[PDB]
Short mmCIF file of all heavy atoms in Angstrom, two decimals:
data_model
loop_
_atom_site.label_atom_id
_atom_site.label_comp_id
_atom_site.label_asym_id
_atom_site.label_seq_id
_atom_site.Cartn_x
_atom_site.Cartn_y
_atom_site.Cartn_z
N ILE A 35 0.86 -1.13 0.00
CA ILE A 35 0.00 0.00 0.00
C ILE A 35 0.93 1.23 0.00
O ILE A 35 1.49 1.56 1.06
CB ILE A 35 -0.95 -0.01 1.22
CG1 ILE A 35 -1.49 -1.44 1.51
CG2 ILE A 35 -2.05 1.03 1.03
CD1 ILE A 35 -2.50 -1.59 2.64
N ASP A 36 1.09 1.86 -1.17
CA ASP A 36 1.85 3.12 -1.29
C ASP A 36 1.10 4.26 -0.60
O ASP A 36 -0.11 4.15 -0.24
CB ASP A 36 2.04 3.48 -2.77
CG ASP A 36 0.70 3.51 -3.50
OD1 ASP A 36 0.04 4.57 -3.45
OD2 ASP A 36 0.23 2.41 -3.96
N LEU A 37 1.76 5.42 -0.49
CA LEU A 37 1.21 6.49 0.33
C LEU A 37 -0.17 6.99 -0.12
O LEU A 37 -1.05 7.19 0.73
CB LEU A 37 2.19 7.69 0.44
CG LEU A 37 1.59 9.02 0.86
CD1 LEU A 37 1.29 9.04 2.33
CD2 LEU A 37 2.49 10.20 0.47
N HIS A 38 -0.34 7.26 -1.43
CA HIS A 38 -1.64 7.67 -1.93
C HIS A 38 -2.73 6.59 -1.79
O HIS A 38 -3.89 6.91 -1.47
CB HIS A 38 -1.51 8.15 -3.39
CG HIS A 38 -0.75 9.43 -3.50
ND1 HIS A 38 -1.27 10.63 -3.08
CD2 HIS A 38 0.53 9.67 -3.86
CE1 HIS A 38 -0.37 11.58 -3.26
NE2 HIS A 38 0.73 11.02 -3.71
N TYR A 39 -2.35 5.34 -1.97
CA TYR A 39 -3.27 4.23 -1.68
C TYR A 39 -3.71 4.12 -0.20
O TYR A 39 -4.89 3.84 0.13
CB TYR A 39 -2.69 2.96 -2.21
CG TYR A 39 -3.67 1.78 -2.41
CD1 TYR A 39 -5.09 1.96 -2.41
CD2 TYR A 39 -3.17 0.55 -2.72
CE1 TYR A 39 -5.92 0.87 -2.62
CE2 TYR A 39 -3.98 -0.54 -2.97
CZ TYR A 39 -5.34 -0.38 -2.90
OH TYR A 39 -6.06 -1.50 -3.14
N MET A 40 -2.79 4.41 0.73
CA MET A 40 -3.14 4.43 2.13
C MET A 40 -4.18 5.47 2.44
O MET A 40 -5.06 5.25 3.31
CB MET A 40 -1.90 4.73 2.99
CG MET A 40 -0.87 3.62 3.04
SD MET A 40 0.43 3.95 4.29
CE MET A 40 1.33 2.42 4.11
N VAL A 41 -4.07 6.63 1.78
CA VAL A 41 -5.05 7.66 2.02
C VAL A 41 -6.46 7.11 1.74
O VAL A 41 -7.40 7.30 2.49
CB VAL A 41 -4.82 8.90 1.15
CG1 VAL A 41 -6.02 9.86 1.19
CG2 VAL A 41 -3.55 9.61 1.59
N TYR A 42 -6.52 6.39 0.67
CA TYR A 42 -7.81 5.85 0.19
C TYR A 42 -8.30 4.70 1.09
O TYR A 42 -9.49 4.65 1.43
CB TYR A 42 -7.62 5.38 -1.26
CG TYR A 42 -8.76 4.53 -1.78
CD1 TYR A 42 -9.98 5.12 -2.10
CD2 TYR A 42 -8.66 3.17 -1.85
CE1 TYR A 42 -11.06 4.37 -2.53
CE2 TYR A 42 -9.74 2.38 -2.23
CZ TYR A 42 -10.94 2.98 -2.58
OH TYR A 42 -11.98 2.19 -3.02
N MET A 43 -7.39 3.86 1.55
CA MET A 43 -7.76 2.61 2.28
C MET A 43 -8.11 3.03 3.65
O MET A 43 -8.97 2.40 4.27
CB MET A 43 -6.66 1.57 2.34
CG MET A 43 -6.30 1.03 1.00
SD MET A 43 -5.33 -0.47 1.01
CE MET A 43 -6.70 -1.55 1.43
N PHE A 44 -7.53 4.13 4.12
CA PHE A 44 -7.84 4.62 5.48
C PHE A 44 -9.14 5.35 5.50
O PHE A 44 -9.94 5.20 6.43
CB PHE A 44 -6.72 5.55 6.01
CG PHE A 44 -6.85 5.85 7.46
CD1 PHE A 44 -6.69 4.83 8.38
CD2 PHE A 44 -7.36 7.05 7.89
CE1 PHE A 44 -6.91 5.03 9.69
CE2 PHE A 44 -7.59 7.28 9.23
CZ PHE A 44 -7.31 6.27 10.14
N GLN A 45 -9.36 6.18 4.48
CA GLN A 45 -10.50 7.08 4.43
C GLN A 45 -11.80 6.30 4.28
O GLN A 45 -12.76 6.61 4.96
CB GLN A 45 -10.36 8.06 3.26
CG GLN A 45 -11.49 9.03 3.10
CD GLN A 45 -11.21 10.06 2.02
OE1 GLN A 45 -10.24 9.97 1.23
NE2 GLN A 45 -12.06 11.04 1.97
N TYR A 46 -11.80 5.30 3.42
CA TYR A 46 -13.02 4.57 3.06
C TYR A 46 -13.00 3.18 3.64
O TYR A 46 -12.04 2.47 3.46
CB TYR A 46 -13.17 4.43 1.53
CG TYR A 46 -13.49 5.75 0.86
CD1 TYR A 46 -12.51 6.43 0.06
CD2 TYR A 46 -14.71 6.36 1.04
CE1 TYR A 46 -12.80 7.62 -0.56
CE2 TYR A 46 -15.00 7.57 0.43
CZ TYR A 46 -14.04 8.19 -0.35
OH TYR A 46 -14.35 9.37 -0.91
N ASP A 47 -14.07 2.80 4.34
CA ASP A 47 -14.11 1.48 4.93
C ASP A 47 -15.51 0.86 4.79
O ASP A 47 -16.50 1.42 5.26
CB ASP A 47 -13.70 1.57 6.37
CG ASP A 47 -13.41 0.22 6.95
OD1 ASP A 47 -14.38 -0.60 7.26
OD2 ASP A 47 -12.18 -0.08 7.11
N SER A 48 -15.58 -0.26 4.09
CA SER A 48 -16.88 -0.86 3.82
C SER A 48 -17.64 -1.21 5.11
O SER A 48 -18.84 -0.98 5.19
CB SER A 48 -16.73 -2.06 2.95
OG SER A 48 -16.14 -1.67 1.71
N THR A 49 -16.93 -1.70 6.11
CA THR A 49 -17.52 -2.13 7.39
C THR A 49 -17.77 -1.03 8.36
O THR A 49 -18.84 -0.92 8.96
CB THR A 49 -16.60 -3.19 7.96
OG1 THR A 49 -16.52 -4.25 6.98
CG2 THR A 49 -17.15 -3.76 9.23
N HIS A 50 -16.81 -0.13 8.54
CA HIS A 50 -16.95 0.83 9.58
C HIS A 50 -17.25 2.22 9.08
O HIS A 50 -17.31 3.13 9.88
CB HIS A 50 -15.70 0.78 10.48
CG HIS A 50 -15.46 -0.58 11.04
ND1 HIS A 50 -16.17 -1.08 12.12
CD2 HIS A 50 -14.68 -1.59 10.60
CE1 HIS A 50 -15.77 -2.32 12.36
NE2 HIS A 50 -14.88 -2.66 11.45
N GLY A 51 -17.48 2.37 7.78
CA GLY A 51 -17.74 3.67 7.21
C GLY A 51 -16.54 4.61 7.10
O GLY A 51 -15.38 4.31 7.48
N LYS A 52 -16.81 5.80 6.57
CA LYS A 52 -15.77 6.77 6.30
C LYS A 52 -15.11 7.31 7.56
O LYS A 52 -15.77 7.53 8.59
CB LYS A 52 -16.37 7.88 5.44
CG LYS A 52 -15.36 8.73 4.65
CD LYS A 52 -16.05 9.79 3.76
CE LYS A 52 -17.21 9.19 2.97
NZ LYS A 52 -17.50 9.92 1.71
N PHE A 53 -13.80 7.55 7.50
CA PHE A 53 -13.09 8.14 8.62
C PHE A 53 -13.71 9.51 8.87
O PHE A 53 -13.88 10.26 7.93
CB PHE A 53 -11.59 8.27 8.32
CG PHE A 53 -10.78 8.84 9.44
CD1 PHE A 53 -10.81 8.24 10.73
CD2 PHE A 53 -10.02 9.96 9.24
CE1 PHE A 53 -10.07 8.78 11.77
CE2 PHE A 53 -9.27 10.49 10.28
CZ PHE A 53 -9.30 9.90 11.55
N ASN A 54 -14.00 9.83 10.13
CA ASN A 54 -14.51 11.17 10.56
C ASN A 54 -13.53 12.33 10.80
O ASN A 54 -13.96 13.42 11.11
CB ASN A 54 -15.31 11.01 11.85
CG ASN A 54 -16.63 10.34 11.62
OD1 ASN A 54 -17.16 10.38 10.51
ND2 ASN A 54 -17.19 9.72 12.66
N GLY A 55 -12.24 12.10 10.65
CA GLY A 55 -11.24 13.18 10.75
C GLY A 55 -10.75 13.54 9.36
O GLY A 55 -11.46 13.42 8.42
N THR A 56 -9.51 13.99 9.25
CA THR A 56 -8.99 14.35 7.92
C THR A 56 -7.88 13.37 7.62
O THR A 56 -7.18 12.92 8.53
CB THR A 56 -8.38 15.76 7.93
OG1 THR A 56 -7.59 15.88 9.11
CG2 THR A 56 -9.45 16.85 7.95
N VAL A 57 -7.74 13.02 6.36
CA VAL A 57 -6.59 12.28 5.95
C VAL A 57 -6.14 12.71 4.58
O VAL A 57 -6.91 12.76 3.66
CB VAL A 57 -6.81 10.75 6.02
CG1 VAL A 57 -8.10 10.32 5.34
CG2 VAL A 57 -5.63 9.98 5.47
N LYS A 58 -4.83 12.95 4.46
CA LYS A 58 -4.19 13.48 3.25
C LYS A 58 -2.76 12.97 3.10
O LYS A 58 -2.12 12.62 4.06
CB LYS A 58 -4.09 14.99 3.36
CG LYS A 58 -5.39 15.73 3.33
CD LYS A 58 -5.71 16.25 1.93
CE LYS A 58 -7.20 16.36 1.71
NZ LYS A 58 -7.54 17.61 1.00
N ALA A 59 -2.25 12.99 1.88
CA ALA A 59 -0.85 12.76 1.63
C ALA A 59 -0.27 14.19 1.52
O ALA A 59 -0.85 15.01 0.83
CB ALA A 59 -0.68 12.05 0.33
N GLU A 60 0.82 14.48 2.20
CA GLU A 60 1.46 15.82 2.17
C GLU A 60 2.91 15.59 2.37
O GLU A 60 3.32 15.08 3.42
CB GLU A 60 0.96 16.73 3.31
CG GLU A 60 -0.52 17.12 3.27
CD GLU A 60 -0.95 18.05 4.41
OE1 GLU A 60 -0.07 18.75 4.99
OE2 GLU A 60 -2.16 18.12 4.71
N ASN A 61 3.71 15.90 1.34
CA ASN A 61 5.16 15.79 1.45
C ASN A 61 5.72 14.42 1.77
O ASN A 61 6.68 14.32 2.55
CB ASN A 61 5.66 16.73 2.54
CG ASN A 61 6.03 18.06 1.99
OD1 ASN A 61 6.88 18.18 1.09
ND2 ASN A 61 5.38 19.09 2.51
N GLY A 62 5.13 13.38 1.21
CA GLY A 62 5.61 12.06 1.35
C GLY A 62 5.17 11.46 2.66
O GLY A 62 5.55 10.35 2.95
N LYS A 63 4.38 12.18 3.46
CA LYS A 63 3.86 11.64 4.69
C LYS A 63 2.37 11.47 4.66
O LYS A 63 1.69 12.12 3.90
CB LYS A 63 4.23 12.55 5.85
CG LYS A 63 5.75 12.54 6.05
CD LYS A 63 6.20 12.94 7.43
CE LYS A 63 7.68 12.60 7.61
NZ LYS A 63 8.06 12.80 9.04
N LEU A 64 1.87 10.58 5.52
CA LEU A 64 0.41 10.34 5.65
C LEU A 64 -0.04 11.24 6.78
O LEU A 64 0.47 11.18 7.87
CB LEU A 64 0.11 8.88 5.93
CG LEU A 64 -1.38 8.55 6.02
CD1 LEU A 64 -2.04 8.74 4.66
CD2 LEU A 64 -1.58 7.14 6.57
N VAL A 65 -0.99 12.08 6.53
CA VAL A 65 -1.39 13.02 7.57
C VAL A 65 -2.81 12.82 8.00
O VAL A 65 -3.74 13.03 7.23
CB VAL A 65 -1.21 14.50 7.11
CG1 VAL A 65 -1.35 15.46 8.31
CG2 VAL A 65 0.16 14.67 6.48
N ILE A 66 -2.98 12.42 9.25
CA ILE A 66 -4.30 12.10 9.77
C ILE A 66 -4.57 13.02 10.97
O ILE A 66 -3.77 13.04 11.86
CB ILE A 66 -4.34 10.63 10.28
CG1 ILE A 66 -4.08 9.61 9.14
CG2 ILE A 66 -5.66 10.39 10.99
CD1 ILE A 66 -4.00 8.12 9.59
N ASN A 67 -5.70 13.74 11.00
CA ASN A 67 -5.97 14.75 12.04
C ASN A 67 -4.76 15.63 12.36
O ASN A 67 -4.38 15.87 13.54
CB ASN A 67 -6.51 14.07 13.31
CG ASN A 67 -7.83 13.38 13.03
OD1 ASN A 67 -8.40 13.52 11.96
ND2 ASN A 67 -8.32 12.67 14.00
N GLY A 68 -4.11 16.04 11.28
CA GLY A 68 -3.01 16.96 11.31
C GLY A 68 -1.72 16.37 11.76
O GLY A 68 -0.76 17.13 11.90
N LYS A 69 -1.66 15.05 12.02
CA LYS A 69 -0.44 14.44 12.52
C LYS A 69 0.24 13.70 11.39
O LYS A 69 -0.34 12.83 10.78
CB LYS A 69 -0.73 13.55 13.75
CG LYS A 69 -1.31 14.37 14.92
CD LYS A 69 -1.01 13.81 16.31
CE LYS A 69 -2.05 12.78 16.80
NZ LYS A 69 -1.53 11.42 17.22
N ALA A 70 1.49 14.06 11.12
CA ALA A 70 2.20 13.53 9.96
C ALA A 70 2.85 12.20 10.32
O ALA A 70 3.47 12.04 11.39
CB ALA A 70 3.24 14.54 9.48
N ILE A 71 2.68 11.21 9.45
CA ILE A 71 3.09 9.86 9.75
C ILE A 71 4.06 9.42 8.72
O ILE A 71 3.82 9.60 7.54
CB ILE A 71 1.89 8.90 9.78
CG1 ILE A 71 0.88 9.31 10.84
CG2 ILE A 71 2.36 7.46 9.98
CD1 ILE A 71 -0.50 8.65 10.70
N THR A 72 5.17 8.85 9.15
CA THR A 72 6.23 8.44 8.27
C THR A 72 5.79 7.12 7.69
O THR A 72 5.29 6.24 8.42
CB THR A 72 7.57 8.26 9.03
OG1 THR A 72 7.98 9.51 9.55
CG2 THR A 72 8.68 7.73 8.14
N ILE A 73 6.00 6.96 6.38
CA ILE A 73 5.53 5.81 5.69
C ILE A 73 6.69 5.04 5.15
O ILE A 73 7.49 5.60 4.45
CB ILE A 73 4.64 6.23 4.51
CG1 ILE A 73 3.38 6.91 5.03
CG2 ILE A 73 4.30 5.02 3.64
CD1 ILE A 73 2.61 6.11 6.07
N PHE A 74 6.76 3.74 5.45
CA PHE A 74 7.79 2.87 4.96
C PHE A 74 7.21 1.84 4.04
O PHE A 74 5.98 1.56 4.06
CB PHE A 74 8.49 2.17 6.13
CG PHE A 74 9.23 3.10 7.04
CD1 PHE A 74 8.82 3.27 8.38
CD2 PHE A 74 10.33 3.79 6.59
CE1 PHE A 74 9.51 4.12 9.23
CE2 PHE A 74 11.03 4.66 7.44
CZ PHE A 74 10.63 4.82 8.76
N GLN A 75 8.08 1.20 3.27
CA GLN A 75 7.59 0.23 2.25
C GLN A 75 8.47 -1.02 2.20
O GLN A 75 8.71 -1.59 1.14
CB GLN A 75 7.47 0.86 0.85
CG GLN A 75 6.62 2.13 0.73
CD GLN A 75 5.14 1.86 0.39
OE1 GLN A 75 4.79 1.59 -0.76
NE2 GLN A 75 4.27 1.98 1.39
N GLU A 76 8.89 -1.48 3.37
CA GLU A 76 9.82 -2.60 3.44
C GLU A 76 9.14 -3.97 3.58
O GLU A 76 8.27 -4.19 4.45
CB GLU A 76 10.74 -2.39 4.60
CG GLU A 76 11.50 -1.08 4.53
CD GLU A 76 12.48 -1.06 3.35
OE1 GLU A 76 12.86 -2.13 2.86
OE2 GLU A 76 12.87 0.04 2.94
N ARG A 77 9.56 -4.89 2.73
CA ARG A 77 9.15 -6.30 2.84
C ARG A 77 9.75 -6.97 4.10
O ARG A 77 9.08 -7.81 4.73
CB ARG A 77 9.56 -7.08 1.59
CG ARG A 77 9.17 -8.56 1.63
CD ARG A 77 9.09 -9.20 0.23
NE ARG A 77 8.05 -8.57 -0.60
CZ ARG A 77 8.23 -7.52 -1.42
NH1 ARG A 77 9.42 -6.95 -1.58
NH2 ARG A 77 7.19 -7.03 -2.09
N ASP A 78 10.98 -6.59 4.46
CA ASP A 78 11.71 -7.23 5.57
C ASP A 78 11.70 -6.28 6.76
O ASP A 78 12.33 -5.20 6.70
CB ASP A 78 13.15 -7.58 5.12
CG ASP A 78 14.01 -8.27 6.21
OD1 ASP A 78 13.59 -8.47 7.37
OD2 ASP A 78 15.16 -8.62 5.88
N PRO A 79 11.00 -6.69 7.85
CA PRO A 79 10.82 -5.78 8.95
C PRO A 79 12.14 -5.40 9.60
O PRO A 79 12.23 -4.36 10.24
CB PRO A 79 9.88 -6.53 9.90
CG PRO A 79 10.16 -7.98 9.63
CD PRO A 79 10.39 -8.00 8.15
N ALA A 80 13.18 -6.21 9.36
CA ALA A 80 14.56 -5.84 9.77
C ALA A 80 15.05 -4.52 9.21
O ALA A 80 15.82 -3.87 9.89
CB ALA A 80 15.54 -6.96 9.46
N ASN A 81 14.57 -4.08 8.03
CA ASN A 81 15.04 -2.83 7.40
C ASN A 81 14.23 -1.57 7.75
O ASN A 81 14.54 -0.45 7.30
CB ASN A 81 15.06 -2.98 5.85
CG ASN A 81 15.97 -4.10 5.39
OD1 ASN A 81 15.69 -4.83 4.42
ND2 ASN A 81 17.04 -4.26 6.11
#
């Protein structure tokens, strides 16, 4: 799940409905209720 895909998977949920806060991609980070989240893409949790 790349960063723009996370925005979508987080925002929309078939079971629990739409997220009630804000979620955006901004500067390579995932930003949820104004809090910027570092996003990694590693297959090996060691890295």
Side-chain angles (χ1 to χ4, degrees):
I35 319 183
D36 54 85
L37 161 76
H38 291 289
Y39 199 14
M40 290 189 177
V41 168
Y42 167 74
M43 295 195 76
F44 191 67
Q45 179 174 10
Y46 290 108
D47 193 285
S48 299
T49 302
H50 304 281
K52 200 177 313 206
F53 182 56
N54 288 336
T56 44
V57 50
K58 293 263 152 138
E60 295 181 22
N61 268 303
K63 294 202 167 189
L64 182 67
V65 192
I66 297 176
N67 297 353
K69 298 208 272 125
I71 300 164
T72 296
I73 295 307
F74 295 115
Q75 306 269 282
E76 303 294 340
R77 180 159 297 91
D78 181 357
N81 300 143

